[PDB]
């Protein structure tokens, strides 16, 4: 099982570098970052970060098509493969509706802008000159001058809705899907290889990531309750179909809902912290992802809260759960 | 035939630290940084370096046993290893009379002290509290809280003289030997093979280093004229023994001694002959030079540095031995 570990560039960078630098040492293979217009810039902290680590991956999770040309995203992706030597990840999502209308943004045809997209960035980046008359996406006679270092630099499209699933099957190197408990992926992946036997290719092709929230310490319950204010957060921003997948109270789910804040935290429950967490000591949390491996997943990201303390959490992960899964 | 690079570090360190990314973009694996107290701090140097790399192994090349304590030298290098992810190496030789006498230290013994600190050195990283009560070095009590990352970091030995390479044999993980020609590599690599079998070691666990003085150019005649400089001042301090080894004349030899001693370097340059170029540095085409380390290879070389003046400009240089060198001797 690969490990990443995913931050929001929200305090000053250096503490992100440390945070970054300090799961390299232990292990994790993949970094990475969120990309809203509120926070730090998300290049930039990748730069530091490229400067202080040596050999984990790292990229945005995830940019989209709207807050920067395609053109100018494929260009920041080869500048970060030639400064980190190789290890850019390019993870790239349809962006929310909240944003684009506080921005001014129309959220055009999401799925279709988001392929030609993703087109039009692997040929820039691979140094073509491209012309591409897509349906949302038009480019004429551009070309990069920067080169990234690897041949293709990966592709991983954050996806939650069927289309994208299979869209993600089709065209991406990788998937990252918000979910932490192993049905979700029982249903997902399906979707996935629907769009992957479609292009023609295999699963072997493609890394399906467990974006997760995790919650570790050497305390399960210390551990169980640095769980809760995410998953009451998650709990409200879920669609009817997975509240009924993994059987929650709406009753509760309208008291988080509202509450949203200790009220919120009150009514989270044991099955919605089975739903959307993985939680517990090591051996707890070393059972969860193997079984989310048997699912076929094959990246589990580390996500908010990564424990009490995030420090701690990174180096107990590191010493007592990543050497358990390969 | 992996490559290194070698730097001397006296220009503004962001200068060095282009340089050493592109040599890494090129395929190069090793990064030497020399430690003269008049330049730039060497670890310093290696920290920034470090900074703006990923993959290159990186170290000091060399230092020595005197202008640092060696438990200083021990935590230093931890530090390179933590911060690159495991990349570094230790490059260490006796230093010399000239610098000690300049800095008042007494040039102590300088076999016992190398293998003292060495073996010092290796036991602080790998976290052993020290007592060593060495003919020199003497230790009670010490103990680093600093860790490297690697289990053992490398330890090259730098070493001319004999009895240095037949040390190295014994207790290096490789060896630094500043020459260019296969008759330097023929009657060194006996000397550490024979230290090895003493100490029981094979030869596979030795990287016998040519820290060697590289020119390339697409034009063999300007690669030649930019080593001449370089093989100027090699010329001139090599041990009478090395330079009848090459037949290089002696009066020649003084002419340059005299001109580099007066700082006239153009008289130096005047001087050196093509029988010093091709004793001294390995130059011309990339053809030519893929040619001459295979020469090398035949001897025991295990890994070539393109030192100084690596070719007319270095930034050109590094891209050609990129383009045209390093893919030809990649077994
Ligand atoms: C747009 C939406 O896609 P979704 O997959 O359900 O949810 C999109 C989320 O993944 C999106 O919000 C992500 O960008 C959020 N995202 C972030 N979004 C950000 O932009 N920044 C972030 O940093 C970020 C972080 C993040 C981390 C992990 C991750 O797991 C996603 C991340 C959707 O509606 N999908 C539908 C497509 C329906 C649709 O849009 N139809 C249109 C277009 C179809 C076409 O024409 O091709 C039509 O009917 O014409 C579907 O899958 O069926
Ligand atoms: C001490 C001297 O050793 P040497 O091998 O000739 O030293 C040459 C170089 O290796 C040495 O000067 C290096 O430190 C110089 N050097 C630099 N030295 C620096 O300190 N900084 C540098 O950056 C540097 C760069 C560098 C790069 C490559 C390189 O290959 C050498 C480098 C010597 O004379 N050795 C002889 C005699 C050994 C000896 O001293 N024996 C004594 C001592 C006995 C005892 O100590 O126990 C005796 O028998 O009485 C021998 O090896 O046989």
């Keep these: ?30 970094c990475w970052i969120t990309d809203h217009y509120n926070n730090r810039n998300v290049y930039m902290a990748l730069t530091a970060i490229a400067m202080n680590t040596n050999k984990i991956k790292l990229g945005p999770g995830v940019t989209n098509p709207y807050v920067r040309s395609p053109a100018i995203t494929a260009s920041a992706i080869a500048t970060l493969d030639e400064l980190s030597g190789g290890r850019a990840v390019l993870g790239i999502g349809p962006g929310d509706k909240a944003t684009f209308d506080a921005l001014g943004i129309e959220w055009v045809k999401p799925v279709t802008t988001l392929k ?30 920067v080169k990234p270092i ?18 993600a099957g089709m065209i991406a190197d990788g998937v990252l899907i918000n979910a932490s408990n192993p049905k979700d992926f029982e249903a997902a992946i399906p979707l996935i290889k629907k769009g992957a036997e479609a292009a023609g290719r295999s699963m072997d092709e493609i890394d399906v990531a467990a974006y997760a929230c995790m919650s570790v310490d050497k305390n399960a319950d210390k551990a169980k309750q640095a769980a809760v204010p995410v998953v009451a957060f998650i709990a409200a921003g879920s669609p009817p179909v997975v509240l009924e997948r993994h059987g929650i109270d709406m009753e509760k789910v309208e008291a988080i809902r509202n509450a949203l804040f200790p009220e919120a935290f009150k009514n989270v429950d044991d099955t919605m912290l089975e739903a959307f967490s993985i939680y517990g000591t090591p ?22 809260p990564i424990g009490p303390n995030k420090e701690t959490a990174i180096k107990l992960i590191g010493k007592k759960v990543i050497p358990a899964l390969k």
């Design 1 to 30: 099982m690969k490990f990443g570990i995913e931050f929001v560039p929200n305090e000053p960078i250096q503490k992100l570098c440390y945070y970054v630098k300090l799961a390299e040492d232990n292990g994790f293979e993949y």
């Design 283 to 304: 051996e707890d949390v070393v059972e969860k992802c193997k079984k989310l491996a048997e699912m076929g997943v094959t990246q589990i990201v580390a996500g908010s």
């Design 150 to 167: 690897q041949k293709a630099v990966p592709v991983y499209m954050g996806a939650q809705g069927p289309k994208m699933l299979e869209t």
């Design 116 to 145: 030609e997209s993703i087109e039009v960035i692997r040929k820039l980046l691979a140094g073509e000159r491209v012309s591409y008359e897509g349906k949302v996406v038009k480019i004429a006679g551009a070309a990069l001058a």
